[PDB]
Amino acid sequence: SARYPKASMHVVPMLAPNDTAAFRALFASGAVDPASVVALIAKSEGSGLHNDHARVFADVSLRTALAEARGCPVEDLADSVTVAVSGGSPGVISPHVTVVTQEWVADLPAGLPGVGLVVGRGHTEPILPEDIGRTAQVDKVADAVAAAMLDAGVTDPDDVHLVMVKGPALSSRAVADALSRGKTVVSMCWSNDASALGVAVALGEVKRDLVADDRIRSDWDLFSAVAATSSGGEKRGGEVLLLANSAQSASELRIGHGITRDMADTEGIKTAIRTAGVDFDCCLSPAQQAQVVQVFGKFVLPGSDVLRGQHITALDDHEAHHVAKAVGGALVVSITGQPMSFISGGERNGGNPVAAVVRRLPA
Amino acid sequence: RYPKASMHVVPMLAPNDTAAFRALFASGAVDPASVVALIAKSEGSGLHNDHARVFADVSLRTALAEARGCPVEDLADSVTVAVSGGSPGVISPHVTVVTQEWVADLPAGLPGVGLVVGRGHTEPILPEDIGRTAQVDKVADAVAAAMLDAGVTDPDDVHLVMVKGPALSSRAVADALSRGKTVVTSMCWSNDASALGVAVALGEVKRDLVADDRIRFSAVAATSSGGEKRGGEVLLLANSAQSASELRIGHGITRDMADTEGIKTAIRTAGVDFDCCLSPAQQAQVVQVFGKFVLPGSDVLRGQHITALDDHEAHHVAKAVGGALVVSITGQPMSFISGGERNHMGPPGGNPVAAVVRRLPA
Amino acid sequence: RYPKASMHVVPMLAPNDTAAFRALFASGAVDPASVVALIAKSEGSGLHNDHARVFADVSLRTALAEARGCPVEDLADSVTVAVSGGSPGVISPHVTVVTQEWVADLPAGLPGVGLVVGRGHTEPILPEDIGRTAQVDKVADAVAAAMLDAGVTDPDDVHLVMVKGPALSSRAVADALSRGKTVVMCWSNDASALGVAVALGEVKRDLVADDRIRSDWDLFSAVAATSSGGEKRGGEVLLLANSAQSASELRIGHGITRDMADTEGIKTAIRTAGVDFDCCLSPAQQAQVVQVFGKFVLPGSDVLRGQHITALDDHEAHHVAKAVGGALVVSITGQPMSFISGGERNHMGPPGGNPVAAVVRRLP
Amino acid sequence: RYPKASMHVVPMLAPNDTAAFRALFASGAVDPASVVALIAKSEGSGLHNDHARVFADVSLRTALAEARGCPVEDLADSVTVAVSGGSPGVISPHVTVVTQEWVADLPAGLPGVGLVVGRGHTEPILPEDIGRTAQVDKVADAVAAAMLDAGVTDPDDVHLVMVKGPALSSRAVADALSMCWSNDASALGVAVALGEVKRDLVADDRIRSDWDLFSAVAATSSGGEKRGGEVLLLANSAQSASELRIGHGITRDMADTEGIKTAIRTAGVDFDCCLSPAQQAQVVQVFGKFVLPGSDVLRGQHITALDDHEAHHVAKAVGGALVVSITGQPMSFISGGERNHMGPPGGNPVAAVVRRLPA
């Protein structure tokens, strides 16, 4: 039966948002089966802001290339593949796409140590505009996260190391509708904040019970160590992509996580790499750097403008969003030596999630 | 007579916040008459028209003149004031106050070599000289003079050379036209000529190799330009066996945009014994880092395409990245991170970085 | 006694270029002791942390103090210094030097009404006051005081009210927390504009409450131009009006910019100030216009003449708004040294309408 | 045979919003086979790496090809697609759809002259040709060809010439080893072909330094690697069946509205200083190029427009505010922001297309 999952990740460069050359070659060479693709996680060149059309262009170009390789119309990929493009690739970040596959096999290969990577996906019930940034969004995301854990065959939340949530944002047209029906409305960071909390609820990090509309954009004590949330568009359907480990994984990869303690801290990144399975003290050898397949780091602006006792400009800077990612990228790439890293963030808030996927090889 | 150089790093919350700078003198901690340089990072764009940078300069000069009890004018040959604009990300704006006194006695038990400061001034650099061989020669002479002022003869003991030169203005280019002369094209012509001057003076580049057509390396030049002052200025940081200073300087070369080995080499050759990472005690031995993060020579990094040369905010991002690398090693946000110019100092895609670290008696 | 107000517009090549400013006094053209306001545009970002703006402020204060022969600290209550940062496109950085003296006799043959300046200061505005009803009341009182200082009783004769107020800092929040209080820039600005509206009888005071402050666009002042920052708990009001007993050789007028491409507000300002023209100004008429003070806040919607615009989404929206406002004003007056402020998000004029005021020559 | 050119201006809410564009064809209002140019403004930076601009190009081509029922590859010589990125302030992103049919009969009562469109292609422009005399010559030949395509012999009847050329990449340089230069060379090519600049005056040395050599009507851009230069030319002709006429003017400085007004006036609107609402609606489109000025002195005063880091964006913001303040129409083609051979020192070209109705 569809019994053991085998997830893989292939990281391929993009020279522009619409450069799918090396992405298409992955399928055309028979290296990867397009039907087994479950997620595309990408960095694009551009502003990274709410109206970054270059980000949308990469999304459209990647969907089109994948649909062509699968031989379907693009309109099919819509529920079957998570496509997550984070805009803004400053400094050392090389734009790319991480192609995530998963197949299920009937038998577990021999000699795979410890736990291994597994992917789960889930979808929310429709989130109405009067739900956005409020307790209904939290509950609905939490259910989709529970569903993604179930899809991955994972029951222990401690084995979940990264949860990507894509939700809807408000538009004047959605407001128009709540308004029609007699409803008030709250928008991107509300949605993002509600989603992260949903993750926390579903992973048992925050009791439910503690949730209410008035805690949502406020009580920083309530948090998920592993949520990475974004919003936009109008799709009332929330989407969850969940990366975990399981003892029964056939995958040749393992995931781990850490928490970036402040804006100059490398210990979160290192912890991610270490708990994913690389045994190292302070720095990675070249061989160990190459064990690291991908890093997914979310570099939200810090909660204060005080860093190691000193004033910094990171909250005042008009280019703050761009700088946060520039810094996060420099930190990750200085450790791993790999410019094609998933560095997202730059939203307003001091700890940030980072996850690392590393090779897990048979004995 | 023995030089004793010191450095005091103090924070600035804005370009005109000289509170903690003035306290240094008012507390008797530091003698304002011994100040030979102010090296500062200000908040702002870091571009050619960054008025916040000029504001810090003016505020720092005014505060120093007041502490010395002189008018601000009387300070203009005697102190190098170098403000680099643009303090993205982890860079905390600040001023490094550099002092030097000469003492009659060399304290006992100071290991190896020690920090020494030298300063120099060029003969006037005409607008037809900018970016051309004349600027090179004139900077080289000012660097030689700064070595002589520091009592240093060995160029291998020079670890950082800051040059401030003039840039073209429309009125300068009017003047050269007046006298029947062409101008070169501009801040970066000046900067490139200056770096080469440093190289010539340190024996890094033979002079016969210089001509206007080569002008677009020194491992240790950190050059900038602007204004109209025809007088070039040189600030030189070195070591000497006869230094009374409780500090030592070292340098390295940043190999590419993600490399930390240049920074680490700077710290290590300055005197900190470490393998890969610094302990907290060792991080606190590092008093200041002076890193220049010019954009790289190509858009290929570890075999992959990067956006750093195409980005409209490239100048700001270069410093953001450089700052992140330095501060991730030293834990000290008040670091001197300059740069963001387009890519003649350092090897190709290579950037200079210097570190000043404690040198304590036995 | 009869007020005599004047305005002299001088260029600045940088935020610390006070050359042409100092020449005004050194040439005997203007008496520095009679300066009551400096209204300036500086080069820079125009954002909350625009240090180039502060640099112009400090430079202008220092030059003025030196010309007066006082320490710079004396000019703190006696002169309004208002520097708006951000001079995109056709806007030439400059300082408008506003003077006022009072004379014992009213010259003959001055037509209609004439310019008068008034100033006021608020009682201290605590951080728990910012963006709330207390700020409104305190600004309103300072506006009433400025009218009284100008000798003006009719709000219809008031054509421009500049308010500078405090903004929140973490350190102010800390204080209000310390005393068991909550807190809440645009809040401050919105509360100030409403204060102006209250004091000019444009909005009845019963309509005011903390919940309306930033939400009910129906409450607005046609002539408020508000800003905030720093920590100075003292609000400041500079008020430009006319009066039948003015000895000034200038008159002020105002208009409302109807949308982002509209020139009729600017033209109405110029026309009601006294220039008689149908659609476009001759060169002689353009030179009658001494200064324009236009506030170009972002619009309330992204729909302009039935089409979508990017002005609310643009990361550079603040800068673009001023670029556009400046282009409109300068295309009419031909004078790049115009006071174009704004770029805040959209209580100041009607839905998305923007105030503009014009000062023009009024000759015997 | 008589040309009948038309223009339909439709909004875009995003670079990939082709909804109103597709409705034009689906409603039978416009025949997609008659489309000869798409001239568009997109939201984005307007800089060399503006991918949003490329996105609009791709989206528009794909929509048009779908409406024609061909593969997108077949539009590649038959339709000029020109997207200028950067839509600050009052500029509403949109596409001007330009059609042209040739008809057997010339309608009665069409006053004066009327709009006609011509197109041309250069021979391949090698990278060693870019910014040099070869690019000039090759562009000039393509402009002569576009005139011939439009049936126009009098350069005075040409009011707008858009040239798209290649820019350099490290990979093109590599080959020759075996942007503004390109734009400058192209403008000069236009000038040569329209008789505005004698060809003996051209040399690699004058290109981008002798400002005395200029075209009043060139609007040039570059990018990509396509060695093929493209020319789109808008003119009038006495034998036009078109219900439109084009005119042009020169913007004298950054705050000047007289160039815009001259464009509208010479295109056929009779007005003194300001347009009535009826007259504003006669103006179908304006194509204005707002290159940064040659100096930082404006009406005797210093401006920041050359020093500003956002200069390119601001120039268009200003140009757009001027155009829209006259016409009341946010969907206007405002390009530019390059550093300052499109027009006199300090001067910028602007063209206007206005209604020309039967008697």
From Swiss-Prot, chain B:
Location of region: RU C: 247-362
One Pfam annotation reads: Amido_AtzD_TrzD
Active site, UniProt feature: 164, 224
* GO MF term list: hydrolase activity, acting on carbon-nitrogen (but not peptide) bonds, in cyclic amides
User: From what superkingdom does this record's organism come?
Assistant: Bacteria
Keyword set for this entry?
A: Disulfide bond, Hydrolase
* Quaternary context: Homotetramer; disulfide-linked. The disulfide forms between 2 monomers in the tetramer, such that each tetramer contains 2 sets of vicinal disulfides.
NCBIfam families for the chain: amido_AtzD_TrzD
| Extra remark | The structural metal found in both cyanuric acid hydrolase and barbiturase is absent in the Frankia CyAH.
Q: What is known of its domains?
A: The monomer structure is formed from three repeating units (RUs) that share the same structure as one another. The monomer and the active site possess nearly threefold rotational symmetry, to the extent that the active site possesses three potential Ser-Lys catalytic dyads, but one of the 3 active site surfaces varies in composition suggesting it is involved in conferring substrate specificity.
Would you tell me the protein name for this molecule? Cyclic amide hydrolase
Q: Which organism is it from?
A: Pseudofrankia inefficax (strain DSM 45817 / CECT 9037 / DDB 130130 / EuI1c) (Frankia inefficax)
